[PDB]
């Protein structure tokens, strides 16, 4: 009953934990293998076969974990709706999603040396360049799609979480902490996209322009902020696609900021009362000094009128009218403040 | 100008009695001979009629 | 009467359907003819004459459909206002609009080989280039203006539709589905503008920079997001005009997003009540543990005070004050929550 | 009295009309003279002396009109505040503003041939270039500052206009017609800035890159939308300053649009009632068909249960549960609609 | 007691004043020394030793002022919480912040000639360049971090200031004066970043492209507005880092503007009443003339009907219907206005 | 059309008495023989029935 | 499931009498032998108890 | 500090009787000898006066 349903929640919570451990382990070994395959050794070395076998070993384990995890999800569906037969839960939508996760998680560098001819025209020079690139680079980039397991772990481990769909979870995360969400994602995308641009463009860049990791972080950062490209224009279409992908995320992350820095500038009910109080004190003092200048200039006008001077009273009259105007301005500003405070 | 002068005089008159005191005249200047001279030329106290007589 | 008026609605609904079929048929044959006229054959081939005759045949049929459609609109005006004479409905505004649709829909590649000298200076090199380009390319681009028949079909076939002007229809479409409108239009503009840039710039690009369709989609995409041009600067003024047109649409479509992602982040009345409940549970637990630390540190201060030690009670006093501060912070956060819930 | 004050309003209204006529006349003759001074003739020709004498003749007349206009403003100040002496109105602020208008309106190409050595390094090449440019080009550009007389005429001739400062007038113009203000200014800045870039950069551009007027309109347009520069990078610092000035106006005019397209997407009280009605009709029909499917699938489940088949009832049970879910979703959507309508 | 606490406020207010005087004095001498060290003399000259000794003398004095200032903050903590022992106030957080200020304020060009090999590849050319740059340039740039003393002085000297954290102070400064904050910071960042780009890139720029101060202000300005780079792409990674830093501040300062120009366009309660009144007067007159045209055209229709003419009455009937439509439109616009005024 | 004509007639009738006067007819034209002719052909005053008779 | 079936039955019962009629059963299918068969197997009218008997 | 200690004591006192029980003292520690020792040193029950005596 309820105890059984809670048990299924625990197993479903545990499986997503291990699927994340093997999810990041497969990516980490891919990153180490890709970095070392360039200069440390060659694609046919025994080290390359060994490291590409750890990724395969982690992928087989991960795929079993995804199947078992969805099997637990089937059991939770059976308990919730009081059904027994498997087919009552194997809807068309669920089959597509199960197959999608398997396809995404089964893409990894297969052991064995396989190469393909890569041809791309250089940027700013339009000069063709042909190199025999390994096939493991077009399979390593999709491995970053395994990061969806981080979202699954987050939802299944959130205290507040446990309709409760991803829409409500993301929306409430943009209210409790709108800065952490827009900073962790921005920094994580920065490193992931910069390494992807460098990895795809280390074959067709011999001048160390974008192949440099520190130069690739600059290219991703200017593109994300939509500043421009400068001279960091990618040569390959993998580096162009990632720059475009960062540009799109750079126009949605600069649209959430405008919609978050607008709510964060408005004053709350408590802050408005404090703000009204301090302004009222300032305007009360201002009305005192503005009127004091009015009397001082008004009498100073009279004093020089009886002095039989012309230029004397003229200056005081000009100052008196200016003091009158400033006196009227502060009165209107004060009166508007009382109107807001009352309402 | 008369309305503004009346508003300033009311602002000075904090006690709300309608008669501004010499102590208030001395106080509103801190924001010696001149104040005494204007008190003498405006007058034992100053009212609104004296205020508008001095203003005009 | 009412039955007659409904009949005019049906005929007006049917004519716009066929005008869209011939509207897209003329464009499709234009796209096929333009693509094949480059490498498959030449402008003087019998295939070019035949395909350019299907466009002319579709344009003559379409223009008759537009005249008949507006004739039905005249009859609907006669029934609605109870008038008989034609001239009572032939206002100056309607004549201009009828003529505008005819002029827009009558622009198509005329059969027969006609050429003009096209001269443009290359980008990033400022080197002039002259080629004898066919005249059908400056007539094929305006054919994309026939897409206004899609809007007419949408309005005349919308269930909710049937003042009901295009302003209200577009505004209500940005509320029911603000993502589909901003995605179908963005993708449709992507393919249309990218092909237009490639078609206009296949004459004055011999390095396969922007003439490549996949390279033209990148140029349109970076310009739409206002990232920059990089090395994809068009040589001709047709490719420059389309890039500018995409830039303008790229500053209005990134201004609707800011005004849509701002309404989509606010919490509804139902969501606010749920959000308040979960926060209240969290703060109730937080107040329990914060005060528990207060007592624990307060007594731990006393325990080491009687121990005749100096460094012992000092640490506990520092922790007690920090616990007091955190206890006060959670109380203020809780009290603010109750204020919002009550109101 | 009141009749006299109205008379001063009429004279003040008439003088600003003539000051605008001579304001645009001075600019127009400057534009014609600048265009013709390049190729039609030389700076020492008698035509250049004659045309530069019309600008001087219009400037002397204009400066007298500005002095007389401000003299009328002095009289209006005297009547309003019941003062007689001039000095009572000659405040320090007014003197600075009167002098500012004289200085702005007295800058024009002085008759006579005067030249200065202009040196600037080319863009994208960093190659220095030196030319003996006429001094009338650095005096013609400030002549566009005379456009402030258009604002003065607009305020003094607006029916709604006649505190009423420029802040309220501009703010109310962004509500009555936010599109016309953002379109007239955008187009007017487009032509003015494009001609200024071409005029300043016709000396140091021998490849017809930015000196072309149609190429200068593209440079101003991409900079205004903050897309980028491409290959249209100005060589001189006058063309760089104008591009920067257009960039700043291109970040404030794309910030007003976000704040205008956000108010123009919200539904009014009348539109909300209509929108609620049409949605309610749609949801009423949806609840009918969703429940009808519920009954149909529920009985279809029973029919195949008695048929002694296994795969038969399984499919109907799966469809029944999906129909139940969709039935629940439409009920929640309908119930939320009634909540909004009631409030 | 209270008098003692006020005394600690005065000493804390005075120390931050002197720490700002020496804070800007250290920066000013650094700027003068850096500018003169390039062409006026060399790094080993006695003038360089003397000027680099004024910075060291100002840094030692400043560090003593920061220690004493925080010592006063300790005493204020002792009085506020009624504690005596130092350790009760030496929390881990305070130690980190005290050490952070010391580390930031102790970075300055050490006297003595020290050089390091600086290598960077040129922009747009990818040609490596190696120069023996002085080590004082990588220590002069961090000296601009001493500007945090300006914020401390502002808070400690604000009349309104004297929870009152930096969040509330900054938020209330964006309401009282949102333009001054966004203009002083923008201009101050403009000069600081432009000089930093020029200073870091005067070694690896021999064509006077970005080393020119006026050319560096243009690069910072276009990057801040996210327009692009053009040909002003920095060669070194110090000039690239500053351009990136200005880009980030250029996407947050163009997000505050959108959230400030949106609050500054809404009409206040007083302005709405005035706006409603002037619109009502306009619509009252419009309803008079629209109906007057209705009667005039309606009777003009009758007059020509009895004239036995065909084309005569047809024109008047068409004008009458147009007048009827315009009459209905103004009635709806007027009625909507009354609805808003009542509510 | 009848409702719009009635609304226009009510707009003309500022005094609210239901009878439009010849002075109002002359006034609503400034926004000589023709007005007198239409007054004669519509009629000592004009009412709503005469208004709809002239409109039709 | 029982609550959802009850809600659907209430939606069908437009007249609010609690008894769904054969005409309503025929009508709710347009959004011949099968409807008559289900009427026979659910039964001179159908109530909520018969509805939940057929649903289960 | 006294107000904060009083607030914490009230938070502990869930039953609202003003007397905190040893069971509550044991419970508020799970978020053996030490609790018994502090109970003995603060005392058959603990009140607000004992709470502020132990706090001070
Ligand atoms: Ca008194
Ligand atoms: Ca009358
Ligand atoms: Ca029934
Ligand atoms: Ca108890
Ligand atoms: K941009
Ligand atoms: K850009």
| Domain-located, residue E124 | no
A82 Rama sector, left if φ>0, alpha if ψ -120 to 50, beta otherwise: left
Burial letters C23-37, b for 16+ CB under 10 A, else e = bebbbebbeebbeeb
Residue pair C4/C86 in contact by the 8 Å Cβ criterion? no
Distance D315 CA to ligand 3 centre (A): 30
Burial letters A118-146, b for 16+ CB under 10 A, else e = bebbbbeeeeebeeebbbbbebbbebeeb
Question: What is the set of domains in chain H, with CATH numbers?
Answer: 1-55 (1.10.238.10)
Q: Report which of D284, H19, E226 is spatially closest to residue A222, judged by C-alpha positions.
A: E226
Q: Are C150 and C7 part of one and the same domain?
A: yes
Neighbours of ion ligand 1 (CB under 5 A): B 20-21
At a CB cut-off of 8 Å and minimum separation 6, what does C201 contact?
C210, C211, C216, C234, C235, C236, C238, C239
Q: Are E228 and E277 part of one and the same domain?
A: no
At a CB cut-off of 8 Å and minimum separation 6, what does C330 contact?
C283, C286, C287, C290
Distance E223 CA to ligand 6 centre (A): 8
A214 vs E237, E251, E262: nearest CB: E237
The DSSP bridge partners found for residue B20 are: B46
Domain end, chosen from A266, A285, A316, is at A266
Q: Report which of E185, E188, E186, E175 is spatially closest to residue E260, judged by C-alpha positions.
A: E175
Q: Which of D:302-321 have CB within 8 Å of A?
A: 311, 314-315, 317-318, 321
Residue pair C225/C255 in contact by the 8 Å Cβ criterion? no
Distance B24 CA to ligand 1 centre (A): 6
Chain E contacts of C311, Cβ < 8 Å? 87
Please judge whether G11 and D291 are an interchain contact, meaning their C-beta atoms are less than 8 angstroms apart: yes
| Domain-located, residue C170 | no
Residue pair C72/C7 in contact by the 8 Å Cβ criterion? no
d(CA A163, CA D110): 76
Burial letters H10-45, b for 16+ CB under 10 A, else e = ebbbeeeeeebbeeebeebeeeeeeeeebbeebeee
Please judge whether D124 and E231 are an interchain contact, meaning their C-beta atoms are less than 8 angstroms apart: yes
Chain C contacts of E311, Cβ < 8 Å? 87
* CB burial of residue A103 (10 Å; 0-12, 13-18, 19+): exposed
Is E160 near chain A, with CB under 8 Å? yes
Please judge whether A271 and E168 are an interchain contact, meaning their C-beta atoms are less than 8 angstroms apart: yes
Q: Are E27 and E143 part of one and the same domain?
A: yes
| Domain-located, residue C160 | no
From the CB of residue E326, how many other CB atoms can be counted at a distance below 10 Å? 16
Residue pair E332/F12 in contact by the 8 Å Cβ criterion? no
Chain D contacts of G20, Cβ < 8 Å? none
Starting from the CA of residue E223, give the closest ligand.
6
C87 vs E91, E258, E318: nearest CB: E318
Residue pair A289/E283 in contact by the 8 Å Cβ criterion? no
Domain end, chosen from E266, E291, E319, is at E266
Please state whether beta strands D128-134 and D115-121 pair in parallel, antiparallel, or not at all (unpaired): antiparallel
Starting from the CA of residue B28, give the closest ligand.
1
Q: Are D255 and D283 part of one and the same domain?
A: no
Please judge whether D318 and A228 are an interchain contact, meaning their C-beta atoms are less than 8 angstroms apart: no
d(CA E335, CA F38): 32
Starting from the CA of residue B21, give the closest ligand.
1
Q: How far is D175 from chain C (nearest CA, A)?
A: 17
d(CA A119, CA E121): 26
B54 vs A292, A299, A324: nearest CB: A299
| Domain-located, residue A137 | no
Q: Report which of A199, A210, A197, A145 is spatially closest to residue A37, judged by C-alpha positions.
A: A199
Please judge whether C87 and E321 are an interchain contact, meaning their C-beta atoms are less than 8 angstroms apart: no
Is H45 annotated in a binding site? The answer is yes
Query: What sign results for the dihedral spanned by CA atoms C148, C150, C156, C161?
Result: negative
Q: How far is C88 from chain E (nearest CA, A)?
A: 5
d(CA A43, CA C232): 35
Touch of A by D (3+ CB pairs closer than 8 Å):
yes
Q: Are D42 and D182 part of one and the same domain?
A: no
Residue pair E109/E33 in contact by the 8 Å Cβ criterion? yes
Please judge whether A271 and E171 are an interchain contact, meaning their C-beta atoms are less than 8 angstroms apart: yes
Burial letters C204-225, b for 16+ CB under 10 A, else e = bbeeebbbbeebbbbbbbbbbb
d(CA A171, CA A176): 9
Q: Are D90 and D11 part of one and the same domain?
A: yes
Question: Cα dihedral angle (A73, A76, A78, A79), rounded to 10 degrees?
Answer: 180
d(CA C130, CA C120): 7
3-state secondary structure chain C: CHHHHHHHHHHHHHHHHHHHHHHHHHHHHHHHHHHHHHHCCCCCCHHHHHHHHHHHHHHHHHHHHHHHHHHHHHHHHHHHHCCCCHHHCCCHHHHHHHHHHHHHHCCCCCCCCCEEEEEEECCCCCCEEEEEEECCHHHHHHHHHHHHHHHHHHHHHCCCCCCCCHHHHHHHHHHHCHHHHHHHHHHHHHHHHHHHHHHHCCCCCCCCCCCCHHHHHHHHHHHHCCCCCCCCCCCCHHHHHHHHHHHHHHHHHHHHCCCCCCCCCCCCHHHHHHHHHHHHHHHHHHHHHHHHHHHHHHHHHHHHHCCCCCHHHHHHHHHHHHHHHHHHHHHHHHHHHHHHHHC
Neighbours of ion ligand 2 (CB under 5 A): F 20-21
Chain F contacts of E288, Cβ < 8 Å? 11, 28, 31
Q: Report which of D282, D288, D276 is spatially closest to residue D338, judged by C-alpha positions.
A: D276
Is D91 near chain A, with CB under 8 Å? yes
| Domain-located, residue C93 | yes
Residue pair D229/C231 in contact by the 8 Å Cβ criterion? no
Residue pair C171/D271 in contact by the 8 Å Cβ criterion? yes
d(CA C327, CA C335): 12
At a CB cut-off of 8 Å and minimum separation 6, what does D97 contact?
none
Q: What is the DSSP string of E214-240?
A: HHHHHHHHHHHTT---TT---SSHHHH
C291 vs H1, H11, H55: nearest CB: H11
Is H13 annotated in a binding site? The answer is yes
**C71 alpha carbon, distance to own chain's centre:** 33
Q: Give the CA distances from residue D52 to residues A81, C15, D27, D48, D197, in Å, rounded to whole numbers and listed in that order.
A: 91, 63, 11, 6, 21
Question: What does the angle CA E67 – CA E70 – CA E76 come to, to the nearest 5 degrees?
Answer: 145
Starting from the CA of residue D251, give the closest ligand.
5
Q: Give the CA distances from residue E215 to residues A33, D220, E133, E190, in Å, rounded to whole numbers and listed in that order.
A: 45, 19, 22, 12
d(CA A287, CA A277): 15
Q: Is A45 helix (H, G, I), strand (E, B) or coil?
A: coil
Chain D contacts of E228, Cβ < 8 Å? 226-229
Is A192 near chain C, with CB under 8 Å? no
Q: Give the CA distances from residue E154 to residues E136, E149, E151, E158, E161, in Å, rounded to whole numbers and listed in that order.
A: 30, 8, 5, 6, 9
Touch of H by C (3+ CB pairs closer than 8 Å):
yes
Residue pair G19/D262 in contact by the 8 Å Cβ criterion? no
d(CA C293, CA H8): 9
Q: Are D126 and D79 part of one and the same domain?
A: yes
Number of domains in chain A: 3
In a 13 Å sphere around the CA of D339, the CA atoms on its Cβ side amount to: 9
Q: Give the CA distances from residue C141 to residues C52, C107, C138, in Å, rounded to whole numbers and listed in that order.
A: 15, 9, 6
- Please give the DSSP secondary-structure letter assigned to residue E147: G
Q: How far is A284 from chain C (nearest CA, A)?
A: 30
| Domain-located, residue C129 | no
d(CA D248, CA D240): 13
3-state secondary structure chain D: CHHHHHHHHHHHHHHHHHHHHHHHHHHHHHHHHHHHHHHCCCCCCHHHHHHHHHHHHHHHHHHHHHHHHHHHHHHHHHHHHCCCCHHHCCCHHHHHHHHHHHHHHCCCCCCCCCEEEEEEECCCCCCEEEEEEECCHHHHHHHHHHHHHHHHHHHHHCCCCCCCCHHHHHHHHHHHCHHHHHHHHHHHHHHHHHHHHHHHCCCCCCCCCCCCHHHHHHHHHHHHCCCCCCCCCCCCHHHHHHHHHHHHHHHHHHHHCCCCCCCCCCCCHHHHHHHHHHHHHHHHHHHHHHHHHHHHHHHHHHHHHCCCCCHHHHHHHHHHHHHHHHHHHHHHHHHHHHHHHHC
d(CA B37, CA B41): 6
Q: Report which of C51, C53, C58, C25 is spatially closest to residue C37, judged by C-alpha positions.
A: C51
* Phi and psi at residue A248, to the nearest 5°: -65, -45
Q: Are E142 and E102 part of one and the same domain?
A: yes
| Domain-located, residue A229 | yes
Please judge whether H8 and C291 are an interchain contact, meaning their C-beta atoms are less than 8 angstroms apart: yes
Is F17 annotated in a binding site? The answer is yes
d(CA C224, CA C244): 9
Is D231 near chain C, with CB under 8 Å? yes
Query: What sign results for the dihedral spanned by CA atoms E259, E264, E270, E274?
Result: negative
**G28 alpha carbon, distance to own chain's centre:** 9
Is G35 near chain D, with CB under 8 Å? no
Is A262 near chain C, with CB under 8 Å? yes
Q: Give the CA distances from residue A170 to residues A261, C272, C273, D212, H6, in Å, rounded to whole numbers and listed in that order.
A: 18, 14, 17, 51, 39
End-to-end CA distance of chain A: give it in Å, rounded.
Answer: 55
Q: Is A229 helix (H, G, I), strand (E, B) or coil?
A: coil
Distance E138 CA to ligand 5 centre (A): 31
Q: What is the DSSP string of H22-52?
A: HHHHHHTT---HHHHHHHHHH---B-HHHHH
d(CA C196, CA C30): 12
Q: Report which of C124, C121, C150, C245 is spatially closest to residue C190, judged by C-alpha positions.
A: C245
- Which method resolved this structure? cryo-EM
Containing E121, the helix (H) or strand (E) segment is strand E115-121
Q: Are C259 and C284 part of one and the same domain?
A: no
Please judge whether A258 and E260 are an interchain contact, meaning their C-beta atoms are less than 8 angstroms apart: no
User: How many Å is the maximal CA-CA distance in chain A?
Assistant: 113
* Phi and psi at residue D263, to the nearest 5°: -75, -25
Q: What is the DSSP string of A303-329?
A: HHHTTT-SHHHHHHHHHHHHHHHHHHH
Please judge whether A298 and B5 are an interchain contact, meaning their C-beta atoms are less than 8 angstroms apart: yes
Q: How far is A223 from chain C (nearest CA, A)?
A: 6
Q: Are D172 and D123 part of one and the same domain?
A: no
| Domain-located, residue C19 | yes
Chain F contacts of E298, Cβ < 8 Å? 5, 54-55
Q: Residue E207: give the domain boundaries.
A: 163-266
d(CA A42, CA E175): 62
Q: Are C74 and C106 part of one and the same domain?
A: yes
Resolution in Å, one decimal, please: 3.4
Q: Report which of A83, G35, G28 is spatially closest to residue D300, judged by C-alpha positions.
A: G35
Please judge whether E209 and D121 are an interchain contact, meaning their C-beta atoms are less than 8 angstroms apart: yes
Domain end, chosen from A266, A283, A309, is at A266
Starting from the CA of residue B51, give the closest ligand.
1
Q: Are C68 and C208 part of one and the same domain?
A: no
At a CB cut-off of 8 Å and minimum separation 6, what does A127 contact?
A121
The DSSP bridge partners found for residue C130 are: C119
CATH number at residue C249: 1.10.287.70
């Amino acid at each position: 009953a309820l105890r059984r349903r809670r048990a299924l929640f625990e197993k479903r919570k545990r499986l997503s934990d291990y699927a994340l451990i093997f999810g990041m382990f497969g990516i980490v070994v891919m990153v180490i293998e890709t970095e070392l395959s360039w200069g440390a050794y060659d694609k046919a070395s025994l080290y390359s076969l060994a490291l590409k076998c750890l990724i395969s070993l982690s992928t087989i384990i991960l795929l079993g974990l995804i199947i078992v995890y969805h099997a637990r999800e089937i059991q939770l569906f059976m308990v919730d709706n009081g059904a027994d037969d498997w087919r009552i839960a194997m809807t068309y939508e669920r089959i597509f999603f199960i197959c999608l996760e398997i396809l995404v998680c089964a893409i990894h560098p297969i052991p064995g040396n396989y190469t393909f001819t890569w041809t791309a025209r250089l940027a700013f020079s339009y000069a063709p360049s042909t190199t025999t690139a390994d096939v493991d680079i077009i399979l390593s980039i999709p491995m970053f799609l395994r990061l969806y397991l981080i979202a699954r772990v987050m939802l299944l481990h959130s205290k507040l979480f446990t309709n409760f769909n991803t829409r409500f979870v993301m929306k409430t995360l943009m209210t409790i902490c709108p800065g952490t969400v827009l900073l962790v994602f921005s920094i994580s995308l920065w490193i992931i996209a910069a390494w992807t641009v460098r990895a795809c463009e280390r074959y067709h860049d011999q001048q160390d322009v974008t192949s440099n990791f520190l130069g690739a972080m600059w290219l991703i950062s200017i593109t994300f902020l939509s500043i421009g490209y400068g001279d960091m224009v990618p040569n390959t279409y993998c580096g162009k696609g990632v720059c475009l992908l960062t540009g799109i995320m750079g126009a949605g992350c600069t649209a959430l900021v405008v919609a978050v820095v607008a709510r964060k500038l408005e004053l709350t009910k408590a802050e408005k009362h404090v703000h009204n109080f301090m302004m009222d004190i300032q305007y009360t003092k201002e009305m005192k000094e503005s009127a004091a200048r009015v009397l001082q200039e008004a009498w100073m006008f009279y004093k020089h009128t009886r002095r039989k001077e012309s230029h004397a009273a003229r200056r005081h009259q000009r100052k008196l009218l200016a003091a009158i105007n400033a006196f009227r301005q502060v009165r209107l500003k004060h009166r508007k403040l009382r109107e807001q405070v009352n309402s | 100008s008369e309305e503004e002068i009346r508003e300033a005089f009311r602002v000075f008159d904090k006690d709300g009695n309608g008669y501004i005191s010499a102590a208030e005249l001395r106080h509103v200047m801190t924001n010696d001979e001149e104040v005494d001279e204007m008190i003498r030329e405006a007058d034992g106290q100053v009212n609104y009629e004296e205020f508008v007589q001095m203003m005009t």
